[PDB]
Amino acid sequence: CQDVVQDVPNVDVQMLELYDRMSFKDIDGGVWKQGWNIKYDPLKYNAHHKLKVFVVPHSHNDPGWIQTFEEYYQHDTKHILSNALRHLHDNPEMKFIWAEISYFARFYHDLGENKKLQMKSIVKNGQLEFVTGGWVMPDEANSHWRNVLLQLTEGQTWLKQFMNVTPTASWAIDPFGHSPTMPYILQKSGFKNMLIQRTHYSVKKELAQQRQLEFLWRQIWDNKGDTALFTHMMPFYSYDIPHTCGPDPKVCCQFDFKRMGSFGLSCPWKVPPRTISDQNVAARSDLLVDQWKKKAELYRTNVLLIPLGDDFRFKQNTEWDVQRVNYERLFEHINSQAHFNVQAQFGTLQEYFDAVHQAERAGQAEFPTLSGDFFTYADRSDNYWSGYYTSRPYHKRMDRVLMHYVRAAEMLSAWHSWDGMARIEERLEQARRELSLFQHHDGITGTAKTHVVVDYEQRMQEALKACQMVMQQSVYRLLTKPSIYSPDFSFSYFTLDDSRWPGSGVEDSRTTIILGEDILPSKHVVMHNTLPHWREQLVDFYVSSPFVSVTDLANNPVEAQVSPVWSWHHDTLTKTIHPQGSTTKYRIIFKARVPPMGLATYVLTISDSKPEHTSYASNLLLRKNPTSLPLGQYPEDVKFGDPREISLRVGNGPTLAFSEQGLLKSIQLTQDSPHVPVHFKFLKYGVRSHGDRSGAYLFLPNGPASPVELGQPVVLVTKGKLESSVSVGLPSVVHQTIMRGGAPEIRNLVDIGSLDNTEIVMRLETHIDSGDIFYTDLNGLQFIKRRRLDKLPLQANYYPIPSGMFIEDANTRLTLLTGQPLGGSSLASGELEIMQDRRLASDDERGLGQGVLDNKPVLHIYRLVLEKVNNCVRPSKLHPAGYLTSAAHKASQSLLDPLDKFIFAENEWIGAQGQFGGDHPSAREDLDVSVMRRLTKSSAKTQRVGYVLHRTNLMQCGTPEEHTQKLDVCHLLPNVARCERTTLTFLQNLEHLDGMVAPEVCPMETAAYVSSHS
Ligand SMILES: *[C@@H]1O[C@H](CO)[C@@H](O)[C@H](O)[C@H]1NC(C)=O
Ligand SMILES: OC[C@H]1NC[C@@H](O)[C@@H](O)[C@@H]1O
Ligand SMILES: [Zn+2]
């Protein structure tokens, strides 16, 4: 295994290093506004060395943006694909590339058999070529790597089954900035090449000058380079035709033949395209070839890529004709005129890359190595696209919830083969597809129109319900005596209980377990642990009585704590935000211990009086002018008092101190250690009254944030043996700090209401001497070192915080883990900040045509980990990566993949069992079974189950960490006939494993295995 910590990779281009040196000056470079006047030696190409030009027709189809997926399909995409089939069929030399499989599958299944065959033929013959082949062209900032893989697999599995092809070249022309997580996944999925486009204009200029636009992109910790994937970065401002033929859009626009009038399109540079004729072809060719040769100066081979497309292009038959015929005339002339020394033709993306590597092998070009990422993107001036790191946070959080439900549903149902009547495969396909669709760069990014966001939400809601159905049917089968098991595949044996989604104050959705002497004495509940190691976690349920005791199936008492059910309300009368307690519902809390990838059953029983093993939390409401707060049967009376500073400690965990405003002030790790200053503060960013305005994409603050006026907020303190908390009703946010014995959990119920042109940020202020360094993660896969650059505007220093961020000095580190992707930064030494929500009244000129005014209450969750790191073996000062500690990693897992909770629906569960998976191996803490998916239906003689195994890298800080079993996923199911290592999509077998044993992976490595069972 490679050492991902102590060996700084030697690369030609390291993006953090490049950023430190670049000046980012935005000067007018001429026709190529953000570049320079490209010059070339006409004698460079000749009869013995010609410029090979591949014109690649394409159509950018967004699976939802200003219209929903279905609306676009009906109005544009079905016509684009129908006419592509006809035109390619009739013109053998014409080519076309396609990226979004969600649309292609929608189209294909509606085609008659005759057309399906014609379509398969033009794909088999190479005219229509799929690029990437994912369900969508995913966002690369907010997306979790697990979902990027999910959607890639969904699209490629469909392609293999129906088109019999697996793309090895990726095409990503629209994500707003790019992540190295893509080449990581692609390279492990059979890919050999990838193309990107949206990178900072300053980066394009810098790399272009050094002809480093094509490079071998390796991971920041990869010293050997085995993760490298050849990457092509487009050099210009856009992927449209005016910005893909050469440096001068005024000239290039003249070669987009759809801009003549009848199509309602024109050239903003004032010179329209002119139909090619024998009379003007020589002059037109001279202009075009000149542009091509200028573009070619920016690359190292004699093979040039010229994309030919734009948004939803190649729709009308007349459009196919005008583009094809005119280019055909140009090709005939150019290729016949030796003085040009050019051979141009329509081509596909794979053809371009194949030619490039042929030139490379011929020894005519050597490519530079590169590591790093391409955030934060700016397409012009100071317009940095960091706003979408937060836009529509409700759905960003929903993405993470569904991410987990899909994993849990696929894993729980994978243990058995199911009869087709159970509709398991059907429900799982639906769930995978709706979540995959949301990975689109206008989905999770929060950059779609209001009604489109609603469509995505509805789709994800249906997906969650599908997951619940599969999960509950699976639990019933896994924990019921076989000879008693009598399933009704439409019946709900269990109801899922989720305490953090939609969340308290967002939607009263969870059911109350109703117990009573005259109705029902007890209730069975079951917890699922999707992680491959034994896990304990506090779980809570709503019960109709405070007198409830918990037992495991062996009838062993389990210590429990009961707390009131508190709800916060904006009292329109008193004009205050205060909590009201329920007098009919209560929360029971207890520690559940669940087997690796297993289940554990518990029983809740009611009693007439306080049970021996259940304690009750005390409650203190701090504020002036208090009023009584009755809690029905709840044992202890609520206490009141004027606002004051308070300190709390649960178990042997840390001691937290809070200000009289209910905000964290300090953390004391041990009774001996000191009170480390850690202050939570909420501030607000505004919008400029002059110039460019912030919108769904852009973050253009009118200066540093201003503190939110808190006034004298109401603070609620709940103190319990198992769980304590401090909650405060601040303007726009009910802020809560929960303590359970370890790193606290933070929950923010964010309701920005009608606060227009406001972005709410949560900041942490500490004494950590971090300077200008901080770390943020990329797709929940790796942590990358960031350097605050004062030479760049505030918004440029904002980065995606898909799952976590941290700052540190020689001795101390503060890590903030998130349960949802949001934007954040460290604008000053010792600080960390993350945006909660943003409400913008205006559009930011990127085509959306609206601001962001559809905000809705969202419950953001986090874990705050303060640690001493002076003993940890960390990367050198020059290493571009950072790594989490065991505690921080486990805290992240507690947010993203918590235990699942099931409540038995009926009064009695006959044949109930107390546990499942007790014999499952408990793998080392840094290893995870990211995916467990049965790949075959019940009729298959040989069953196949696929697993995606990921091993992260945790810092060694002197903790023994021992006793763990080897995890061999290939033997998790009995009767294993073979074990094979496969690409991450499970589509290609890479190795036949002897002994049918799937070996564990190395740190920061991800592998896939498929076990076959007879
Ligand atoms: C799929 O393509 C391969 C070539 O890569 C070919 O050998 C095989 O017969 C094809 N399968 C079908 C009929 O779809
Ligand atoms: O300008 C941004 C916007 N342009 C049109 C579409 O491609 C959409 O996805 C994108 O966000
Ligand atoms: Zn797009």
Tab-separated table of N, CA and C and ligand atoms in Angstrom, residues 60 62 65 174 176 198 239 311 385 440-442 447 697 846-847, ligand 2:
chain	number	residue	atom	x	y	z
A	60	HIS	N	-26.247	19.845	-25.439
A	60	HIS	CA	-26.295	19.851	-23.982
A	60	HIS	C	-27.746	19.797	-23.507
A	62	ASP	N	-30.075	19.387	-20.310
A	62	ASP	CA	-30.194	19.420	-18.863
A	62	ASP	C	-31.417	18.666	-18.375
A	65	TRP	N	-34.026	22.192	-15.417
A	65	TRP	CA	-33.368	23.473	-15.171
A	65	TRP	C	-34.448	24.551	-15.171
A	174	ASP	N	-20.440	21.285	-18.292
A	174	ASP	CA	-21.196	22.276	-17.536
A	174	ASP	C	-21.079	22.354	-16.010
A	176	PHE	N	-20.131	23.478	-12.510
A	176	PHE	CA	-19.527	24.771	-12.165
A	176	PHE	C	-18.267	24.616	-11.315
A	198	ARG	N	-15.603	24.100	-17.321
A	198	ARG	CA	-15.730	25.237	-16.423
A	198	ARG	C	-14.679	25.341	-15.336
A	239	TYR	N	-18.788	26.410	-23.865
A	239	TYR	CA	-18.774	25.227	-24.716
A	239	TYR	C	-19.613	25.491	-25.965
A	311	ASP	N	-26.854	24.364	-25.980
A	311	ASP	CA	-28.003	23.855	-25.238
A	311	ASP	C	-29.133	23.361	-26.133
A	385	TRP	N	-18.627	31.490	-8.592
A	385	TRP	CA	-19.808	30.661	-8.406
A	385	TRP	C	-19.802	29.879	-7.100
A	440	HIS	N	-27.746	15.905	-10.908
A	440	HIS	CA	-27.587	16.823	-12.032
A	440	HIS	C	-27.049	18.167	-11.543
A	441	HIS	N	-26.295	18.861	-12.395
A	441	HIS	CA	-25.715	20.145	-12.012
A	441	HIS	C	-26.693	21.314	-11.857
A	442	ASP	N	-27.994	21.029	-11.927
A	442	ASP	CA	-29.021	22.043	-11.670
A	442	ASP	C	-29.965	21.464	-10.624
A	447	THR	N	-29.855	25.355	-8.548
A	447	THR	CA	-29.874	26.356	-9.608
A	447	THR	C	-31.012	26.191	-10.621
A	697	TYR	N	-26.464	31.160	-8.405
A	697	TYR	CA	-25.108	30.721	-8.716
A	697	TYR	C	-24.024	31.531	-8.017
A	846	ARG	N	-27.318	34.378	-15.317
A	846	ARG	CA	-26.780	33.121	-15.820
A	846	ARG	C	-27.881	32.288	-16.481
A	847	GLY	N	-29.003	32.937	-16.789
A	847	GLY	CA	-30.095	32.254	-17.466
A	847	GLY	C	-31.265	31.723	-16.658
B	2	LIG	O1	-25.691	29.527	-17.144
B	2	LIG	C1	-25.894	28.354	-16.381
B	2	LIG	C2	-26.932	27.348	-16.880
B	2	LIG	N1	-26.906	27.420	-18.374
B	2	LIG	C3	-27.864	26.511	-19.093
B	2	LIG	C4	-27.873	25.092	-18.571
B	2	LIG	O2	-26.842	24.330	-19.189
B	2	LIG	C5	-27.781	25.028	-16.986
B	2	LIG	O3	-27.496	23.700	-16.556
B	2	LIG	C6	-26.710	25.953	-16.405
B	2	LIG	O4	-26.744	25.928	-14.974
